[PDB]
Amino acid sequence: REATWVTEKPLTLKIHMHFRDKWVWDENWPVAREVARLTNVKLVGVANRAATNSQEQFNLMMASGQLPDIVGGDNLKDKFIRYGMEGAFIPLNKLIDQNAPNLKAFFKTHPEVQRAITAPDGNIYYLPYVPDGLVSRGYFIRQDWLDKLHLKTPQTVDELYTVLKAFKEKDPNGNGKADEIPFINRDPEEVFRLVNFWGARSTGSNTWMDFYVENGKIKHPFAEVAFKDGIKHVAQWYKEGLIDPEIFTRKARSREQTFGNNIGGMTHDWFASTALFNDALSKNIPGFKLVPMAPPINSKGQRWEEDARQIPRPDGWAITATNKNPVETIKLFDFYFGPKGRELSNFGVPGLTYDIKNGKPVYKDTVLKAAQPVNNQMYDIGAQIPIGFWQDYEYERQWTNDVALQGIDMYIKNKYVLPQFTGVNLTVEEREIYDKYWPDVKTYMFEMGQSWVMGTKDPEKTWNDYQQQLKNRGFYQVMIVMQKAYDRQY
């Protein structure tokens, strides 16, 4: 028996958690095993290991006529709210109030987090992934390639074009082959963010393809004429091979591949893990220096960093109506928001990945000096996963090197980060329109975006058809309710 036990009799529950198109909940995870030891509740995964579409797996689960006890994963906020109000997920308000002291204390000190996760009916249907930190992504460029080609740090988009063209054509890796790929990215959606260079938005927040506000008006980036004009330039850069031809396909290991083989010249990605490649490749590629770069002055005369950490993220977990032990489940959920539970969900397992030194969790040298970024190492053992948990920036600080730290400091000091969209408060009937049309519109917008970038569709020629399709698919009905909710709030 332990003092942290939430049940005397051992309990096993079924969890469907497919996340980030790559992972599922693993009961064999060191973190999962330690939480199970401490709480006396074991979670067994029921999601499909083979699948590469997390959203599709949720949809199949909901249509399968049989629900597990817990459902977790990334980008499930809208689905948690929709199916919560339908009765598939249970409200947590009373359960938290009666059984979850840690969450109660958290929500009163973080009222904006409670607001962001609350449904239009007043119910909380899930607990969120709560990130910790301020900045997220920044631009990184190969300083050693700039120096080798005797080029200055590009200050404008036009200067950047010249630099990326030189990366492609002037053989900076010195192997006599045109193998260089100037701009690479882990995230296909970052190719859309390049429209920032031409004064167009791609998203209002860390959530992909999110709305934004300009002059008291709700706008969606993909519906704006600025995007039409901006994506033409992105398409041109793709055409000329300045953007990774595989930007839509390469994905997760883009940096390991392109930086590791000394072909990648630039990216836009998280400071800590991106700067880590300087250390990992220090001997394999002598002189490898990937440095933070201020965003280039765009066509609107400004230096935009569009991305920032989003607190909370639209990720987390919920309790189903089929769960026979909702009290034990909410108590397990609450363990994660206490000191020990928070430490495990961030750092891993004590004596394995970290040690308590002077009362502080300190990562082992084997973790810090490893080839893999620490967050990747955490995923492998069940930490830093998009369950209901509270991230602790102290975990991140420990593997944020001086190059990363100084880049973060530059971005904070110079205020590059654009004001982020914090959402609007929809009513139940407004949310019905939102849930009916928006997911399918977003999928269509992505498809059109990819087509424009790859040149299979001409953005100028197809814009009228695209706008007609947006209307036919209900996008403008969504826009009406979004503005209606904004005007009511502000």
Ligand X SMILES: O=C(O)[C@H]1O[C@@H](O[C@H]2[C@H](O)[C@H](O)[C@H](O[C@H]3[C@H](O)[C@H](O)[C@H](O)O[C@@H]3C(=O)O)O[C@@H]2C(=O)O)[C@@H](O)[C@@H](O)[C@@H]1O
CB 256 within 8 A of CB 376: no
Residue 20 binding ligand X, by CB under 6 A = yes
From residue 142, alpha-carbon distances to 86, 148, 194, 279 in Å are: 51, 10, 18, 14
Cβ proximity to ligand X, 140 vs 211, nearer residue: 140
- Tokens describing residue 144: 């050693």
What minimum distance in Å lies between the beta carbon of 171 and Ca ion?
4
Question: What's the rounded Cα separation, in Å, for the pair 324 and 327?
Answer: 9
CB 127 within 8 A of CB 103: yes
Residue whose structure tokens are 């390469």: 250
The response to whether 158 counts as a known ligand-binding position is no
Cβ proximity to ligand X, 151 vs 405, nearer residue: 405
Cβ proximity to ligand X, 375 vs 450, nearer residue: 375
**Interface map 159-198 toward ligand X (x if CB under 6 A):** ----------------------------------------
What minimum distance in Å lies between the beta carbon of 165 and ligand X?
28
Residue 396 binding ligand X, by CB under 6 A = yes
What minimum distance in Å lies between the beta carbon of 224 and ligand X?
24
The response to whether 171 counts as a known ligand-binding position is yes
From residue 172, alpha-carbon distances to 175, 177, 241, 285 in Å are: 8, 10, 16, 12
From residue 32, alpha-carbon distances to 21, 115, 354, 384, 394 in Å are: 20, 29, 16, 12, 21
Beta-bridged to residue 362, according to DSSP, are 355
Beta-bridged to residue 350, according to DSSP, are 354
- Tokens describing residue 147: 């120096």
Residues that contact ligand X, how many (by CB under 6 A): 12
What minimum distance in Å lies between the beta carbon of 68 and ligand X?
20
Cβ proximity to ligand X, 169 vs 189, nearer residue: 189
Of positions 48, 375, 398, 401, contacts ligand X by CB under 6 A: 375
What minimum distance in Å lies between the beta carbon of 12 and ligand X?
27
Residue 272 binding ligand X, by CB under 6 A = yes
What minimum distance in Å lies between the beta carbon of 275 and ligand X?
8
Residue 273 binding ligand X, by CB under 6 A = yes
- Region near ligand X per CB under 6 A, out of 100-108, 154-162, 256-264, 267-275: 267-275
Reference 16, options 59, 304, 473; nearest CA is: 59
Query: How much of the chain is helix, strand and coil, in % rounded to 5?
Result: 45, 15, 40
By CB under 6 A, name the binding residues for ligand X. Answer: 20-21, 74-75, 252, 270, 272-273, 373, 375, 384, 396
Give the annotated binding-site residues: 171, 173, 175, 177, 179-180
Which residues define the annotated binding site for Ca(2+)? 171, 173, 175, 177, 179-180
